[PDB]
Amino acid sequence: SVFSMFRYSNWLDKLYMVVGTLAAIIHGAGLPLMMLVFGEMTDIFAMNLEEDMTRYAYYYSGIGAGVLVAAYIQVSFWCLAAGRQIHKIRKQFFHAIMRQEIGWFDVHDVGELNTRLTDDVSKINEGIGDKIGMFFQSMATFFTGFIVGFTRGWKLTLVILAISPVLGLSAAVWAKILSSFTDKELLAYAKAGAVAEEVLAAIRTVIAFGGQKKELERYNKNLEEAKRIGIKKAITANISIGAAFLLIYASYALAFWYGTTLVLSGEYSIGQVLTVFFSVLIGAFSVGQASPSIEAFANARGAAYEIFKIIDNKPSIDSYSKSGHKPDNIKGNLEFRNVHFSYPSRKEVKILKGLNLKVQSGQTVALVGNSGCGKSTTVQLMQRLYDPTEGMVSVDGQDIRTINVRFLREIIGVVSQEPVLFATTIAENIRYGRENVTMDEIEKAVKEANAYDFIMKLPHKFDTLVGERGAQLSGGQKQRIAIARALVRNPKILLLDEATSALDTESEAVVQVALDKARKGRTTIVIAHRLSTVRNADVIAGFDDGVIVEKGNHDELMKEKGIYFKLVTMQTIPPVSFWRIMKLNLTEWPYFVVGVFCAIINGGLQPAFAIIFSKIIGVFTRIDDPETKRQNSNLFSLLFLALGIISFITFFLQGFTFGKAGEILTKRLRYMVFRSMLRQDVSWFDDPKNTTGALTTRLANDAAQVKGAIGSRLAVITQNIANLGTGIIISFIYGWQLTLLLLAIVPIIAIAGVVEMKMLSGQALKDKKELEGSGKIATEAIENFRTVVSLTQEQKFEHMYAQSLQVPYRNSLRKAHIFGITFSFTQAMMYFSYAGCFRFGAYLVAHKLMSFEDVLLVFSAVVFGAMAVGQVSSFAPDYAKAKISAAHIIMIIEKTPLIDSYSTEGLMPNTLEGNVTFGEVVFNYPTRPDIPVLQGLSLEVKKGQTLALVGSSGCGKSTVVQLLERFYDPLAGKVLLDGKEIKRLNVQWLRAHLGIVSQEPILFDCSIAENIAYGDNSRVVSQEEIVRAAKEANIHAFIESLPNKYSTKVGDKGTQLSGGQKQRIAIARALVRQPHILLLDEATSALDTESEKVVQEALDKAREGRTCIVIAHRLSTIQNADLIVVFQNGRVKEHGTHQQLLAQKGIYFSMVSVQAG
């Protein structure tokens, strides 16, 4: 449970921690040892000074070198240990994420995970770093001061000590509370990150439907809750230190009241009391030094909760286990028997009510039925993605649950219904099928899958960089690449899930011939809705209610006049000083004013304790009337109490006004940044440097890095600067000629700080540039887990992540040495200065240039700034990283796009009739400028007409759809809506009228009702309209049959539904707007013949009154089109009515002559 974050420590890390703790103890035992000679001189003061102060200077000079070594040994080893354990924890967390099963991904939300690697890990990196060394040093100083107090005093030290246990108990309680608070804060941040990645992954649909504001508010709610938690966290963290300081000062007042009895009892001398006080009081500031370390440790302990909860889990179907069975001569034989299955998300519904199947080697089985019977369900069940509730699945007699999972999945080549590619080159995507593949095999596969032509046509032939999820390829090229990826594997069992949809007739024929050439040695399962591809199948079977009903050859099933017969008959780099972020925080200026004033008050009091001590020294060395000693000293007994009451008031506010002011700004720093990328042009998201992982990592990383240096950590920096200023002013006022000696070392410390800052600033930029690359791989593997599991590429992704985590590891190791050396230098130069100042004070009192009663005061005041100097020097890395973080935040905020979604300038005509005119339009994509996709096309559409765009795959038919929505602007030519340029028209007004259906629809993680209602924004869509649209899309019956009718959540990108169901939902979403212009892009690609007829009749009924542009391959849909436009290398070569182009025996005639039985 506790100390669970150190469970990846070797012998070396334990050695590092042990030696670092010892060095911290030695280094912290330095300051209390300097008070012995202080008290001895004070007692003697109540031929010898030049004999004593010189040996005191000798001792100080020796302690200086001791500290010089000990501080480095303390800092560097702890930093190295923290870096190594952080690297191991990251690596093992990713490994444990890879080990989970598909059902776990379905039940849980993976959106949190991507933001748990970046932020949640980093917080741990602060709790187990050098902060533990600082806490150990503070504890050592506390105990050494109390030990020397015991040696020089018996009862006063015990009286002071009598109040330590309550302080420890209070610290423990507050740490426990805020550790619990940190968990909820991090959970809220995780929810915000999940929303951010969900919005960023489907940016094209969000831009198309103009739903930026709704997603912005949905993201802002979680930030508001995070701020609400952070305020309470700051409040309790501040009370933790305020109560401690108040108790310390009350204890000091009681101790002084007791010690004033020296005059009456006579047991002790004034020198002993002065020694005891001056030695004990160092612990009073050691507690304040220690508290932030406890805060950071509690934060890290609260952060490790979910990380180790995830790692501690154990899957049921583990792909990494090698304890399975495996055969050698595997023959192709598939056997389903009494398979009952239900998905984990919806356990109540039954999908397979018991089916049986037998497939022999060299056999092609086709499964035919309506949408929702469970064809893809049994395809997934074959790969052992899920385990059936009842019955068993076997290959060659042996049960699936017995043989090895990795071996079983390595002999199955699967093409899923919707291919998913990765953000790499084409060659790497092909090579992902099998690791050890030569170029010859890849060439053979891409020739067999009919993908050789367009690959050679592109520049960077086999190194062309595809986008995320293969978004930079076409709709058919993606499917061909997936087919080639499956064919590289050379599998015993091949499973195709409608791999013949996007391909046209020629490519389909080529692929079918190539596949049938080597059909004898394979076992094959094919899922298809077209029936021409099923004609040449070895055996055809029919689904109904999840159970198989029909079997046999084509002729036998036709004679059986069953489902198959019915279907056949129906078919007939600017650096910024971060002071700009300070200026951005201007609105909360009173908080800063109160914080600075309070910090000045409570920081400049510790040196003033030297003046107080000198005054109570003088009150003892009076001449007469001891009664005033009972009286005057009594006055001081009040003062120590009074300060405490102020201290509680001050040490609270100093942290609060600052701590709150950070929480206000951090939210404002995210809310704006997300408001900026949500505005950027689509071409900005095509930049390889910008990917969902990079953006989602940046969102958390920039704000966290700024908050690290901008938060309550600045309060202690201000306090310590005030302490140094008060000390130097006190030394300048009472003493003199010694402030110059103390300032003689400022240039050296300044040079050390400058060089440290320069080196850390050089390091941080290179670390930041690679952290995004580290996060991209994590998000790319997380979002496409089904494809990765099916390809068994879990080891390669883990290796790539480990390779990406390399440079930050080296930078973290080097930072340890750099920081340790600088810390030791600045910590030792000041002890050397103390020795020099003591010697010079001895000389000055020898020459009668200045008394010793006041150089005593000067030394006492100056020595109190050692811990302050240490704290100030411990602020380098935070500012070093926050500088570039603020620079990048300002850069992203100040950027403006070219096509502004938020702008209001433009023309918004009252009425439009709906003419579309493309005139001599040429266009080139930004990522591949050299490739011409459109070469001067012209398109004319009037109101109440339907245009069908046809052509070979990759001819630019969806490019016009992208252009009409103003995703990109053409290089030349003209685009006119109602005789007016779209450039002059308003962008949001243009996008609010026309609705589109993408080539591959993407939904969101919410209910079906909200998914349908998302079509029309800036309006509350009534439930009646939603139901009417669902009925018009022929999905109302299925939705109503579903338990939790309209409240069932659709999974990430719409995976809890079949392809046809979510395509119908997308059509319904597009039809809610009742758009004046409709853009259909393969809307009927995956639809049953009944849903197709219903949707077609619905669109035909309301054809008059609106404009529609359809892109399709099925010629039956194109039959009803008013006019048809044929593409040819970008140009439009044929245009006219159906009959006119029927007479002109061109490409359309070629496509219609091939669909004849």
Ligand SMILES: Nc1ncnc2c1ncn2[C@@H]1O[C@H](COP(=O)(O)OP(=O)(O)OP(O)(O)=S)[C@@H](O)[C@H]1O
């Ligand atoms: N991951 C999932 N979790 C829960 N239910 C699911 C999931 N995937 C699919 N379903 C349900 O399974 C049923 C149909 O799923 P599928 O087996 O994919 O249908 P299908 O045969 O693939 O349809 P076609 O022929 O591909 S258009 C529907 O009721 C879906 O809601």
Ligand SMILES: Nc1ncnc2c1ncn2[C@@H]1O[C@H](COP(=O)(O)OP(=O)(O)OP(O)(O)=S)[C@@H](O)[C@H]1O
């Ligand atoms: N983001 C992109 N950057 C550069 N080129 C792209 C991008 N997306 C697509 N292309 C190319 O532009 C052409 C247009 O094809 P796509 O619109 O992607 O799909 P498609 O198969 O052509 O569908 P249509 O309707 O026929 S255009 C193809 O040559 C694609 O390879």
Ligand SMILES: [Mg+2]
């Ligand atoms: Mg399917």
Ligand SMILES: [Mg+2]
């Ligand atoms: Mg296409």
